[PDB]
Amino acid sequence: DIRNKIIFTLLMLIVFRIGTFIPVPSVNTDVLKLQDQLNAFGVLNIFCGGALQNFSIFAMGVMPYITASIIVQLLQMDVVPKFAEWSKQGEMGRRKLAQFTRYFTIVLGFIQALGMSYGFNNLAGGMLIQNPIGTYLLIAVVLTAGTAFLMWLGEQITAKGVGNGISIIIFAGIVSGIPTILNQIYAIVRLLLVALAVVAVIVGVIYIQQAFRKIPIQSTHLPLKVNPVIFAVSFLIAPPTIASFFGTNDRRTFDYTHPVGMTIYVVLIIAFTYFYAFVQVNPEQMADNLKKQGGYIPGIRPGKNTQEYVTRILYRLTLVGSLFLAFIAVLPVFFVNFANLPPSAQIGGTSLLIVVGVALETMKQLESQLVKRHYRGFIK
């Protein structure tokens, strides 16, 4: 009964939420607040720079796993050939490559934990970690230990409860910010407009990702999906910061506020959107594969003509997928422009796509397991 396994996915979120308040050994917890630029609702939880930063054992979340996942996916796709041999193999392919990723996150956590603990000081005086080089390393260990469990949960809660655990853990972090509504009571006046606009963007995203290119294959349709997701904006954020790595020591044009910076920004959304989805979904691969086991696209010759067909299909299709994702990135500043708002809060962006995305993904997965007890039975 899905319900009795549902109890387990709320229980796994209960342990994730209870670990939110386990503090890092090196915090002076007073300074973690009053770094608060707003009211929090957390201990070890801040509102500053539009950020919910919760510095705790889970401070960096499953996030180091996702970055190791995208790096190894880029890594196997040439660069290193050793992962390419794992890529085409299978079973074994997911096994050793996810095992390598697993060890790549845990090493990436140590450096992300280190970087987060030092730069958090420059925010608060020059002060308040612990007794300041030996004692960082316990804070690289304890924070890496935070992701390690949080990684353990994901692969426990996917094989026990509802849909894939890493996606529901990320979804748990984004939605857990309900105090954002409390903090913003603050500033009936135009609130009707804000609530209509959050329902307007949740309908805009739901019309877009649930939309499907039918490509018939010979009552079996191979969907070209969605009009290609989050990995565009994260990719996009990288190049501005690298030429901007020059900031700390050796600038204004890369400023993300300025219109030289939104055009450089918006150009990179499109490129990283396009490229990633030129690869991630339906390159030459889905053509050369139809020839191995399968049929054809009706009326279209298999082989090169199929790869030319799906490529032209992809190109024209991807433009609207791309321009849709740039606009979900720049929406918060417009929402924050006419805003009733501080620069504290989630309203309008990639935070929402994951929230609506994991909601649909976990809703469709429930029912896939729920199809035993409806219309399995017959002739009676």
């Epitope: 503090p23 002076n28 917890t29 007073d30 607040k33 009053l34 201990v43």
Partner: nanobody, 115 residues
Framework: QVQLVETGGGLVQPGGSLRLSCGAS???????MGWYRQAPGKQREVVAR???????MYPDSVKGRFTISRDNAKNTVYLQMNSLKPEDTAVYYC???????????WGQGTQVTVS
């Protein structure tokens, strides 16, 4: 649990000194203790922090010029401010925590102006 009322602020020329006094009429203090400023155009930084062990921490900007100390019986913490500079101009707030039993408790601040 308690209330914090602080005093000892005022106007002084650079190089002068002052002593901030933070009283608690309800008195426990027997914790983690600090002073933070928050000038306008703002955000606050912790000026001094004294631990339950009586460990003492200051930021680099303040180092050696300020001294934090705690008076038993009547609940009071003292921020001794020496060699004041125009950068020190701000309202000064006294806060208490138990450390991880959570949140700091503010106080209505004392204005400090170095002219």
């Amino acid at each position: 649990q308690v209330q914090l009322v602080e005093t000892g602020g005022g106007l002084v020329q650079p190089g002068g000194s002052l002593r901030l006094s933070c009283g608690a009429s309800g008195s426990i203090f027997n914790y983690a203790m600090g002073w933070y400023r928050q000038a306008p155009g703002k955000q606050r930084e912790v000026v001094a922090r004294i631990a339950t062990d009586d460990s003492t921490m200051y930021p680099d900007s303040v180092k050696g010029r300020f001294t934090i100390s705690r008076d038993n019986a009547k609940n009071t913490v003292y921020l001794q401010m020496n060699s004041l500079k125009p950068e020190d101009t701000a309202v000064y707030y006294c806060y208490y925590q138990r450390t991880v039993m959570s949140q700091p408790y503010w106080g209505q601040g004392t204005q400090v102006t170095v002219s």
